[PDB]
Amino acid sequence: GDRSDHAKKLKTFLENLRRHLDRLDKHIKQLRDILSENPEDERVKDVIDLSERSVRIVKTVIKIFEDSVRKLLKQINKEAEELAKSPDPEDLKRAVELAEAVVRADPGSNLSKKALEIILRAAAELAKLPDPDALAAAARAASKVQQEQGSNLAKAAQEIMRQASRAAEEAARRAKETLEKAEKDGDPETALKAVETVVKVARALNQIATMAGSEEAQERAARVASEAARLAERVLELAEKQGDPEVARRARELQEKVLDILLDILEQILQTATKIIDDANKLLEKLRRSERKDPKVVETYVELLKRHERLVKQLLEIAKAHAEAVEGGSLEH
Amino acid sequence: GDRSDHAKKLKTFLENLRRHLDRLDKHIKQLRDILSENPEDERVKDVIDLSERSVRIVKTVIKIFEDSVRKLLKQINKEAEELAKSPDPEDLKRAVELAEAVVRADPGSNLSKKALEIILRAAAELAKLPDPDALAAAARAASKVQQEQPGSNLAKAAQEIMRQASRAAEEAARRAKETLEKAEKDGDPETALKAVETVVKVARALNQIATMAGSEEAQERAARVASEAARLAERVLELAEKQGDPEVARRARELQEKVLDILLDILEQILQTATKIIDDANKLLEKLRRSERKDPKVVETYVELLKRHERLVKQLLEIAKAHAEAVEGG
Amino acid sequence: DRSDHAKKLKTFLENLRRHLDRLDKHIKQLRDILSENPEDERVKDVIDLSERSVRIVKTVIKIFEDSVRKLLKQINKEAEELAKSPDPEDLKRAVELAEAVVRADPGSNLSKKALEIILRAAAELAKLPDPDALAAAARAASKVQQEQPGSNLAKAAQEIMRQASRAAEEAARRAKETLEKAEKDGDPETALKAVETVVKVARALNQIATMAGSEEAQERAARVASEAARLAERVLELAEKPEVARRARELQEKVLDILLDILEQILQTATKIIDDANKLLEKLRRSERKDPKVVETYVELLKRHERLVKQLLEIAKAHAEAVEGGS
């Protein structure tokens, strides 16, 4: 946007001044280098002084700006901390965006630190809300805390993620019940909305899993997603039963969403397996060239082979589930 | 949209699996090498055991997955067949995308053949619909079939459908003229605005249908059609200013531009064709200068290229002339 | 829509001559073959047919280039009359149409007359207080100065560019006047728009300044920018005393970005000079016999550079105030 270009312009602008500063200095040196040719000549020395003043001047400009920028980040910090307390989702999320941006402007600083801590509160609060996308966002923001940081904040961040997973799971549980409760009542509109929500929890679960990369987390997300198709399959039935032609498309479209979700999870797992083996080869590559085998390393190699057997085994399992989802089309009609 | 986004991903995903096989299968081969050095290294036998099993897993994953998708496409190709029967153009248009979407995934197979047959039915349906843009989209879908397999029965049908689309468009264009005269008698420029507007869309629509077919003759019929539409604009302009809708009459003089656009687009294609032809002619001659003996079979086609190339230029000018006749009225 | 056409037009004329060449190359093929063996009659015919079509294609260019000129002439006349029209949207159309004529055929006389037409329109566009439009008058007019610099025309642009500036400053002043009224009345939407109007003036003025390039122009733009935030601080407090408070903060964020824009513009100028100054220098150190007049040129650039850097400071301080004020 306009402000997002200007933030880069802020990051760019600062770099530009150093760029100009060099140009002064590189030019200065040339005048400095002309000095040695005719040292006695004062005029050149006078010139150096003029251009030097410019350099010194410019330095202050950096000082002011970096102060001003840092000051603006402080002001930006405050808005977030306040936006963290307000329970409204957009307000809390707005606290995140403002927070994250302060970091991007200048990571690895104590100003960023307070912004890092500020995020944490928001994600916990967002973790309370049951909107899947919101819960996904907290995972996004929470994961950013760890990925940027193994740190205590990350250790706390993991809890928010953990809370998020459980929060997403409970959100999955209740919507399942309501979606379940509706079938005997026969209101398909509530079902299509109830159905879509679990899927949202599946995405979240998948999205959250990737960010921390837990195959188990992928599995739970995997567990969630598969049920959805069965739930979507049954929703298509109530639509076919009650003469509800529009909803059928909502059921039909939901089927594809999970497939890509499942596919998204499948491809998510396979990328890890790729990495895992490559670790083994580099690890293995040392053994053959190794003077003497090292058990701690050799055992480490084993786990890699064994976990690939894990990760590969997961792919096989989920593959059937993905094949199951396809089955729902033929049987019902 | 995001369903079409995934189809690239799913096809891509397969390659990473096949990629993983060679990674694993290669990695095993190295372990095989280590075992070759010391054929009695029990652990080396143990490690290899895991991998050939893991390979068996993935090997199963593929056959499962690619079979799963084959059955999947079956759903999509089947469901679209029902959509074609329905009269809702949007549903058909939607139906087209699925059959269209299918072919991209698995070109050249039997199921794609079933998609092609489906695509035509919906395309044939759109030739009946009177919306000029819709008549174009049908052609657009129809031509894709001719591209997939020329010289087939479907290639025959497609050209047969594309022809009907060109036919249908003129009827709507004729209709506006009929309704145009009514607008003249009933003194309502606003109607003629859309009436002429519909005509303009036809010529534009007809060009696009002309382009895919890439037949110079059809282009001139589209050109001839467009040339009159420019005259209609003048007929719209005169009646409009007098009878009380200048601001709407502002669109007509603006519409006069669109005709010039269509005329430019027609000529651009006509030349682009002509350039290609003359290139081949040069190529054919090049073969003939080098050749030990002139093979009349090549010469005959070479000359025919020149003859055909000539016709286009004549076609180009008479069009180029009409383009001015369009401007001159302005 | 139209954007594609003018470009699409340019190719076709280019491709036409381009096509004409391929024909002559084919003729070159038959001319050589013919020279190798005069006896082949079949070459002559194919030459003739190849020769026949070339004339037609050559003719078509004449038809088209002529016809294209007529439309450029027609648009010029319609552009002029639309120029007369007071309605502002009509004014743009004239420009938009008038520019098309120029970019379609730079340097031509017909193009010269349109550029002349163009110039009249911006003057009419200058009068209207809407800041967004004022820049447009400055925008299109500046294009003319670059197309025909230093001519009798360029002075009109420069003078026309100046006229907007004198007019523009008052439209921002009207906002200051409107807000004090808006403040007493208490309409939060009414007060915010005045700031956004003042903010618009800023971005417009710097663009006008940046487009002419004079460091002075950006300087006059400097003083206004600072006090917009002092206004923007009031509106949020007026709205507090939801929709209006959230945007009031945004306005401050738009000002600082505007300060930044002014900053980058000062710099780019400044930095370009030092290359020129350094490049200027190298020639001096190199040339055995120095040319004192050229030395002076160098000096004024280093002096100017110092002058331009000072401004950055003077600006950067004002900018600094804006952030503090927003605290």
Author numbering:
A (entry chain B): 0 to 148, 150 to 333
B (entry chain C): 0 to 329
C (entry chain A): 1 to 241, 245 to 330
Text of the article:
We develop a hierarchical approach to designing multi-component protein assemblies from two classes of modular building blocks: designed helical repeat proteins (DHRs) and helical bundle oligomers (HBs). We first rigidly fuse DHRs to HBs to generate a large library of oligomeric building blocks. We then generate assemblies with cyclic, dihedral, and point group symmetries from these building blocks using architecture guided rigid helical fusion with new software named WORMS. X-ray crystallography and cryo-electron microscopy characterization show that the hierarchical design approach can accurately generate a wide range of assemblies, including a 43 nm diameter icosahedral nanocage.
First, we explored the generation of C3, C4, and C5 assemblies with WORMS using heterodimer fusions. This resulted in head-to-tail cyclic ring structures dubbed “crowns” (Crn). We solved the structure of the C3_Crn-05 to 3.19 A resolution. The overall topology is as designed and the backbone geometry at each of the three junctions is close to the design model. A deviation at the tip of the undesigned heterodimeric HB is likely to due to crystal packing. Each of these structures experimentally verifies three distinct helical fusions (two HF, one WORMS) from the building block library that had not been characterized in isolation, confirming that the building blocks in the in silico library can have sufficient accuracy for subsequent building efforts.
